[PDB]
Design a binder for these strands. Structure first.
Ligand code: SAH
Ligand code: SAH
Ligand code: MG
Ligand code: MG
Lengths: 291, 193, 291, 193
DNA sequence: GCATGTGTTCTAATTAGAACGCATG
DNA sequence: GCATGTGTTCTAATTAGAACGCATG
């Protein structure tokens, strides 16, 4: 365990976010009250970058595709107090029958996180604080989960968003954050039931919904594939504002770039559950400045 | 890494991964007679090897990485061999203070595609050098080499295009080429003969 | 013209809104501070109704297609202190070369407003106040504007949204509201320039934009058909939240019912300029309760 | 509207529009052959007539409306005759306290379509009654009538099949038809002969 | 003197929707 | 002992985009 830091010696946090997506990492850090000194984001999706820049007003330094981040980039942009990221899981999750493992396809991109992490690590003799985290799906081959744990020299903590959200989202979390194995607990403002996430004059058929993916089919629940919502006595799918409240994102967080239903669900379907990440980043406010 | 006086050159301690180089290394005089296990350590499957293993396996002077010789005998993806090689190299590197010289190398037997090659150069922080062995009447030997040996990237090897290297991809099937590749190491360690 | 009413005598306003669209009339009345006693809306578009219901939390009574409203309905739902409506202009606006005029197609829906207005009018001997308003496009056949003025026994005042918004929108406004011909003056919270309506990291090419229709071509300005926005050194069209700000609607007002770019522009394209309507409904504060 | 005794029946004050029925009203005896200047006002283009014009033209006991008979004389859209009729009808209504009987009627000579006819009934608050006006040997005349005259709505006329009379419209390509529907007005006003 | 428009329309992109998949509590 | 899934796919409905239109200050 790293030594406690006096409140006066604390400086703002400097974050390197790989595969940043829609800047969930920056969002939870800001909503925790933590001062964000620098947030270097590696992201290639145009719409994702549009969300991060517009919703956060240019506080995020975007450093496009991760495989073009050199060693010199790390120490120039650094030092980094936090290195987070979640690699694409299209070739790792079991929802894809044509997944290619983590040695082919997009599964290789994990090793870019591994590669850049050891760059960002403080060299020997520097006992300054340094925290990191890596997220991915549970439904991966045991060999993949084995090797990821080997390269990170750490075993993951599984946290399901079912306990803090209205959706099933079971994900592995490697890292060294303080107290990741602690029992997660819900907050007052945690929208725990689908009815809490819906708009006016809409009825929820379930308390909790199945795992949200990029595709529209994951919204129809079960083998029945029933519609999860009823309004005006008519069955309906979830709304973009409702998907946002399910993930714990601010309302209209993805109302950017003239995106429609499918585009906004694609960004949200791959994102992080905000309250899960809030649970993980919460003990960081004892090591960095807050206002 | 400056040169070492001849009387202070200790025997080399090498770690050979995915391929056993004891025979090729002894031939040029790096390992003394036998029943001494300190000279070489060989592991073929690393999926379960941790840093504490390599740390306790004794400090190493050289870390050798090699891909399977070209043949349809690889359960592993071609990228697997580099990622694992880069994994333990960080385990085998000593403290930031330099008590002795530390070297490493990785050879590809024309197994990596261009996508695996650029990832290879990125992770090993250098573009590779190519080792051709042709005497006109022969086409035989060719490998790609990533290494921190100063003399491995010092002289000017025979520049050959690799539109000619895929013609060398006979795929149906060392002494001169690989020994030439290794000679500059014994100017740093003990000459056994 | 209209007798003043003491503050204690003021009672909340009861409004009949025909062709309500996205409930612009209700939004304006509520933002002015006027207590809305009853808002009976006639609208047939599902997405339009979805906006009014969700954004105003069910305070709006939807009735339906205007041609099914009877004289009994007007007396049952009434009495009404205000009758507002904008008839569809697809067969009246000069932008449509195949427009059918006031008497065929959709143009004859104006007579439904005329029909129900006289139903709602206070009978002879009822000195109580009563206001009304009818809006439509300027680009209208001379005979149609003549006949509309004939049936309403009134001549229209033209107000262009350019004076209070960042867009060209010239519309005729029949009615009996207090001081409709008064000079239109801008407010401190009016976004008069397109740059005021854009998101972060977006450059306005123009100070003002051409009239916005339902289709995406009206965003391409002038004969050049140029894009009105530059982002990251790239030409781009307006965004849905930007169109909302251009019109004076609250941002994300049309983030409803999984609507995309085209659907949200269609609703806004037919809508009213909110600051124009605020200019028209402002003198009603001196006739009804306010909180 | 109760019956008025014979010695209190004034002559009619008729507003006729789109069509002059002066010959029909004189014939049945609502109109004196000698009158000054007249008790019947007739307009054909009402697009520029205002309420104070109709108010100026003296109180009206009856307001009559009629579409043009089948032909190419249909200068204006068919629905135009209705909206303008309803517009002028409200102009002719007197104060709420009714001093005398006020009657109105609007006739269509099978020109309006179904979409126009249900718009017609909505604005006139009444479904129309059709006049068969067809002898056993002669099926000549046919009209549609919206009217607040009690007897027009009171008694049973010969029912007809729309499907057969939908084709009667283009077979064209008077008293029993319309003036027989004019007769019951006589009891409320003066009879001249 | 010439650019403008609360739209209809037809065509070219483009996305919606569900079939598909099986190791595993 | 069956139901589940940070997705690929292929087709069938989708919209997107620009042509069209001209009386007019
Ligand atoms: N080569 C690459 N370099 C940088 N980012 C990449 C990349 N390839 C894919 N990505 C991005 O990595 C992201 C992984 S999805 C994870 C999103 C993020 N964790 C969130 O909270 O939203 C995707 O958005 C994808 O666009
Ligand atoms: N028959 C009918 N009955 C009621 N509303 C109708 C209708 N036909 C069309 N409409 C509606 O009339 C509206 C005219 S567009 C006017 C929109 C409104 N003034 C606003 O501020 O947004 C459209 O929304 C259209 O859906
Ligand atoms: Mg852990
Ligand atoms: Mg006026």
């Amino acid at each position: 365990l790293y030594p406690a830091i006096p409140a006066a010696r604390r400086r703002p946090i400097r974050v390197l976010s790989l595969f940043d997506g829609i800047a969930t990492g920056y969002l939870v850090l800001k909503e925790l009250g933590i001062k964000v000194g620098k947030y270097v984001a590696s992201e290639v999706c145009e719409e994702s970058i549009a969300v991060g820049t517009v919703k956060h007003e240019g506080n995020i330094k975007y450093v496009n595709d991760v495989r073009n981040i050199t060693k010199k980039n790390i120490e120039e942009w650094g030092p980094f107090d936090l290195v987070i990221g979640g690699s694409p899981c299209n070739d790792l999750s079991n929802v894809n029958p044509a997944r290619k493992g983590l040695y082919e396809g997009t599964g290789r991109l994990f090793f870019e996180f591994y590669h850049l992490l050891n760059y960002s690590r403080p060299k020997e003799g520097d006992d300054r604080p340094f925290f990191w985290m890596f997220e991915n799906v549970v439904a991966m081959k045991v060999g993949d989960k084995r090797d990821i744990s080997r390269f990170l020299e750490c075993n993951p903590v599984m946290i399901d968003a079912i306990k803090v959200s209205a959706a099933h989202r079971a994900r592995y979390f490697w890292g060294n954050l303080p107290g990741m194995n602690r029992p997660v607990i819900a907050s007052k403002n945690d929208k725990l039931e689908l009815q809490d996430c819906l708009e006016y004059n809409r009825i929820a058929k379930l308390k909790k919904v199945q795992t949200i993916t990029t595709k529209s089919n994951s919204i129809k629940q079960g083998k029945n594939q029933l519609f999860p919502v009823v309004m005006n006595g008519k069955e309906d799918v979830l709304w973009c504002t409702e998907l946002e409240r399910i993930f714990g994102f601010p309302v209209h967080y993805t109302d950017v770039s003239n995106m429609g239903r499918g585009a906004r669900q694609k960004l949200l379907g791959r994102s992080w559950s905000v309250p899960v990440i809030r649970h993980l980043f919460a003990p960081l406010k004892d090591y960095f400045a807050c206002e | 890494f400056e040169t070492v006086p001849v009387w202070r050159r200790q025997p080399v301690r090498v770690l050979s991964l995915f391929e056993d180089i004891k025979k090729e290394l002894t031939s040029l005089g790096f390992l003394e007679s036998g029943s001494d296990p300190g000279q070489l350590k060989h592991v073929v499957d690393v999926t379960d090897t941790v840093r504490k293993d390599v740390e306790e396996w004794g400090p190493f002077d050289l870390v050798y990485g090699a891909t399977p010789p070209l043949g349809h005998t690889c359960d592993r993806p071609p990228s697997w061999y580099l990622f694992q090689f880069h994994r333990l190299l960080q385990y085998a590197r000593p403290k930031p203070g330099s008590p002795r010289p530390f070297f490493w190398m990785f050879v590809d037997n024309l197994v990596l595609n261009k996508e695996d090659l650029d990832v290879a150069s990125r992770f090993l922080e250098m573009e590779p050098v190519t080792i051709p062995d042709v005497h006109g009447g022969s086409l035989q030997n060719a490998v790609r080499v990533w290494s921190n040996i100063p003399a491995i990237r010092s002289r000017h090897w025979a520049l050959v295009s690799e539109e000619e290297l895929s013609l060398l991809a006979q795929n149906k099937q060392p002494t001169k080429l690989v020994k030439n590749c290794f000679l500059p190491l014994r100017e740093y360690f003990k000459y056994f003969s």
